[PDB]
Design a protein around this ligand. Structure first.
Ligand SMILES: *[C@@H]1O[C@H](CO)[C@@H](O)[C@H](O)[C@H]1NC(C)=O
Ligand SMILES: *[C@@H]1O[C@H](CO)[C@@H](O)[C@H](O)[C@H]1NC(C)=O
Ligand SMILES: *[C@@H]1O[C@H](CO)[C@@H](O)[C@H](O)[C@H]1NC(C)=O
Ligand SMILES: *[C@@H]1O[C@H](CO)[C@@H](O)[C@H](O)[C@H]1NC(C)=O
Ligand SMILES: *[C@@H]1O[C@H](CO)[C@@H](O)[C@H](O)[C@H]1NC(C)=O
Ligand SMILES: [Ca+2]
Ligand SMILES: [Ca+2]
Ligand SMILES: [Ca+2]
Ligand SMILES: [Ca+2]
Ligand SMILES: [Ca+2]
Ligand SMILES: [Ca+2]
Ligand SMILES: [Ca+2]
Ligand SMILES: [Ca+2]
Ligand SMILES: [Ca+2]
Ligand SMILES: [Ca+2]
Ligand SMILES: [Ca+2]
Ligand SMILES: [Ca+2]
Ligand SMILES: [Ca+2]
Ligand SMILES: [Ca+2]
Ligand SMILES: [Ca+2]
Lengths: 38, 265, 265, 272, 265, 272
């Protein structure tokens, strides 16, 4: 080559948890932190 | 983790749909195409395998997961078909002079058979149920059968004179023979060239997918003449080339794999 | 015991299913197969009839209840078929050049017809509904029809010049003609050799079972081109040996006799 | 109209629209020259019209349009009628040709033209295909990669392309949806258009005069559907065929249904 | 998303006027000009097309949305005009010898016709209402009509002697025939060269805009000689050159697209 | 079936499955050509059949299979029988061969193929080995260090490799688990497959007809187990051996149990 990327996202959507996600959604994951674990 | 046991399963109707397995089962599975020599002959290219693999790459199937396994003819493929993959696709040309051969092939690969050996010289066998048959493979099988009465005497055939026996096959590379279930038969076969095995048809192998590339649907899988069914993994195309066929297979491979289900056995 | 009358009958849903009429209907009924000369030619045996009867004996049918009735060809059989047996089976060979003939045979035997005579020279006949057809039997029928207007003149033909008529049949051993319903037709037929009857189509004949030994299902029983159905007693098989075909028929005779139901008349 | 509809279940069934749809509609048969030849008559059309006049279809409503052959008809079918019936013979050589004819006439297409020499196109969904018509369309395709280079083919050497069509009057090419292809085509003879399939054309009705039902409308080899307006007959003559048609025409028109999309004389919508 | 139905619509008078669609429809639509070969002749420039496209770029239309489609003459354009775009502009020269031809062209392209076929040989047709006409195209048409009386006989013409007929067309590429509505007519047409279709006039085609580059407004779209209307998308211009005309069109294209509205069908 | 099983301790023991498992199962002996040679008869098979017919195994249940050599049998065994017995002659020069055969057929293997030229393979656990079959398998291997260079070998020179096998028909290669090995094998005459060992195969029964027990099923020299379907006989003839087998067949079938995983005819499952 999105047709399969969207499907990967919709497969990974609900497997993700909620408590830890809310714990992670308060962090300023600036450019370094966002592109380090990749 | 019980093996070889069957137990009651339980559940409910409030469950959320867990996942979406496509684009992961592809990565973690292997696909195997079975194409005829006619197709490579019409193509005349040494890179079409890599090309199709790169194409499948877009559909998500990675490089080292797709395989190709040529076969000269339907007979040569029916002789001991060793289908060992997590997903199998088979292309099948139509020929009115081969309907029975390519229906036996379908009945063999589509269905999961439990096959015991047979020793003709000593023992005389009989079929118990409607799903019990005798499948003969080899270069050329020539089968003859004499049914027998209760006192091990022939009926229309002489136990000593093989010529009196009744012929059901004549130099076939694959036979699937169904005879009267409940009577003992004495058999004659070219055992030095072909082997016969007493098989029982279990449920269907959901791992393979046959694709008749030409004529109308004719495959009478079930031996009985009343059902003449047609399953999900029995497909049909109309053709004038093979590149279009392969492109279509690629573009609709996801449908094929939704029609196929990994094995239980 | 009121014959010729149809009265309301009652029942219930609390009753329990009775015993199996099977294994007694075999003894109290008769069977009649219709095989082609090609079959006995391939077989080349003089006791295959008694062999099949001894085989049937294991399935329950006694010796003098089953009958075999050869037929030289499909058209020679279609010409005045006299099917008088409590259970009839027919083995029918596929041929692209005989499609309409072996569909008219089907529509003529699978269904029960109420036939009245027809005097072409003296009268002018028409059709009323979609089940009033003209069935012509004989050795070589050549039928021609001229439709007429309100005032007994021609429409695209002349009632005196037979050459102007429209040719619907040309040297056929069996024809089942459906024309427009609500107009008068003036007919010309070679009545020396062929007899034509005005037949209405009633409910189907459940006493005969057709088995297409060869290719794909093509039999269009229905004159209406929209439905193209496939009933329960129109079976299909793929074949390479007639011994294999007969063994199949014997081994699955019970499904056939379940797909068939004795006449009500 | 995006607004919603409403209704009820106490309303009663209204009178028959048959015997008036005939008076205020037209019918058009498409038969082969073989039929006219076997018949060898001149007033058979007037005969069929005077027959139709009993079933209700008036004089100036029925039409007969000859076509020399299946491919000649496939080349730009100009269907413009309120009801179209087509009779098509069976031929194992023309199986795919008369499946593509079905896929073209039975369905409604929205077609955009193509500029091959200056551009390179791709497909988007499972219903966007490339239809080429003309005297002889010989198409070859070479897929490309993200950086405009060939995959198992050479962008210069036309003899290294993958020839999907060899001397065919009507081709319906479906290729892998997502990748860019380069095309070599006989533009001097054939024109090729990127067409998306809309809902079905309920105005036409195919009749396979011969063998078993083989037409695979949907290009995916999983459905193999059999639609309402796809009939099958067995024949040894043509007069019996036409009499059957006339006698069971009400069923054909009950299985057909006048269009909804728009008025158009082509077999496909053109919107650049 | 209901299709093929007509439902009541609702609204209000408190809603505010939304932002302008120009500069978005200019991108999400297509434009198609039709010019005469005389213009390209007087110009003699191989880049005028790209020049006008780059000029449209300033007015909003992108580069690959505008099309120029030549035509040698008004009649050669009237012969089967296949207009398929989203906004069509037509330039038309004035010629008193072509008044009726280029009025028929206007009445054809400006309006939307529902067109059924015609079988001259068999049937004798008639016009029901004032908007059913007979439009004929081809290289050169020669039409001759004969009205009929109550008893299927001619009125000042003979059903055999074609010469007696009345001649409405003489070697015309496009003809639009309106005859007395309510009487059966017989026709003679050289159908080898021309095709005639029986059409019904519906609401106007809001997709095309005609521009008469020359003399006074003569185009009578409506066939009744009482209206003689001048519509919004029916323009007039005075000219001595063509570059000035094209610059005028480019500078006033927004007015043209405001006077035009995308199709409803 | 991940679900659990429940039971009790008060239930009564059910009737004996013996005298019915015989009727509903088959048995297959594998015997060497030496046996038929020393016998020098042509009806010994029917004799053993009619003896089993007294021991309760019906007529069409027993089968025999001559195998010319232990290695010839080791080359792609095709076991499809509800009960298998194998009579194995002793030969100290074939100790490792008929230990590999034992480890191969007594246990159940799940095998993937191996492309030595396109890839470099390794092991994951202590049960992931490389079984090579064929007529003459000469194998050589080079372990690679952390930086994809050879340890005591060179990636280009095959002479420097370490020869682990030499003209064998069956080899079960186990190596250091956690390093990448390059291989060189006679791919024309032998196929080598990476197989994981699984739960045992309770369908076969090896009977060593000669010397003391030597078979080391477990490839690690710490267990040295002895299972129940691994028997031993002392012999001077073969008819006495077959009479022993017949008289004590019930014990062998008590020591054996039908498989649970699935149906198959080979000594190993194939999963690519
Ligand atoms: C689906 O997701 C759940 C957790 O979200 C996981 O436990 C399960 O294994 C997934 N299904 C499959 C087939 O892997
Ligand atoms: C009907 O079937 C039942 C159950 O098999 C049996 O007990 C009964 O005897 C049968 N009826 C007759 C008349 O034999
Ligand atoms: C509908 O049919 C009925 C019964 O024939 C008739 O009484 C009625 O008038 C018909 N409807 C109309 C609108 O004529
Ligand atoms: C239309 O113009 C107004 C005023 O500038 C602006 O607020 C609005 O966003 C515009 N509409 C769109 C769709 O951008
Ligand atoms: C089990 O064996 C006992 C003793 O031989 C016998 O009485 C009983 O009937 C057997 N069980 C069954 C179900 O026949
Ligand atoms: Ca065969
Ligand atoms: Ca015989
Ligand atoms: Ca059977
Ligand atoms: Ca006939
Ligand atoms: Ca009729
Ligand atoms: Ca005539
Ligand atoms: Ca084609
Ligand atoms: Ca190439
Ligand atoms: Ca596609
Ligand atoms: Ca004119
Ligand atoms: Ca006159
Ligand atoms: Ca008028
Ligand atoms: Ca070894
Ligand atoms: Ca070394
Ligand atoms: Ca190891």
């Amino acid at each position: 080559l999105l047709g399969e990327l969207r499907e990967e996202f919709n497969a990974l959507s609900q497997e993700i948890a909620m408590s830890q996600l809310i714990d992670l959604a308060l962090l300023p994951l600036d450019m370094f932190s966002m592109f380090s674990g990749i | 983790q019980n093996y070889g046991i069957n137990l009651p399963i339980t559940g409910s109707m409030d469950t959320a749909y867990a996942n979406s397995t496509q684009e992961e089962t592809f990565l973690t599975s292997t696909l195997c195409l079975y194409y005829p020599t006619e197709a490579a002959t019409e193509i005349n290219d040494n890179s079409w395998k890599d090309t199709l693999s790169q194409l499948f790459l877009t559909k998500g199937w990675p490089t080292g997961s797709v395989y190709f396994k040529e076969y000269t003819d339907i007979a040569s493929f029916s002789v001991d078909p060793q289908l060992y993959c997590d997903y199998n696709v088979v292309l099948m040309k139509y020929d009115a002079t081969l309907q029975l051969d390519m229906s036996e092939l379908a009945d063999l690969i589509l269905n999961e058979w439990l096959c015991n050996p047979m020793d003709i010289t000593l023992y005389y066998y009989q079929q118990t149920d409607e799903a019990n048959k005798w499948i003969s493979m080899g270069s050329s099988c020539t089968i003859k059968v004499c049914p027998l009465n209760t006192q091990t005497l022939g009926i229309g055939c002489l136990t000593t004179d093989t010529a009196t026996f009744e012929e059901v096959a004549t130099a076939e590379k694959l036979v699937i023979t169904d005879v009267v279930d409940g009577v003992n038969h004495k058999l004659d076969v070219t055992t030095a060239t072909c082997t016969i095995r007493n098989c029982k048809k279990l449920g269907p192998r959901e791992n393979v997918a046959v694709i008749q590339v030409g004529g109308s649907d004719v495959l009478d899988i079930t031996a009985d003449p009343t059902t003449a069914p047609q399953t999900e993994r029995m497909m049909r195309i109309n053709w004038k080339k093979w590149w279009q066929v392969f492109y279509t297979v690629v573009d609709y491979v996801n449908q094929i794999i939704q029609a196929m289900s990994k094995r239980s056995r």
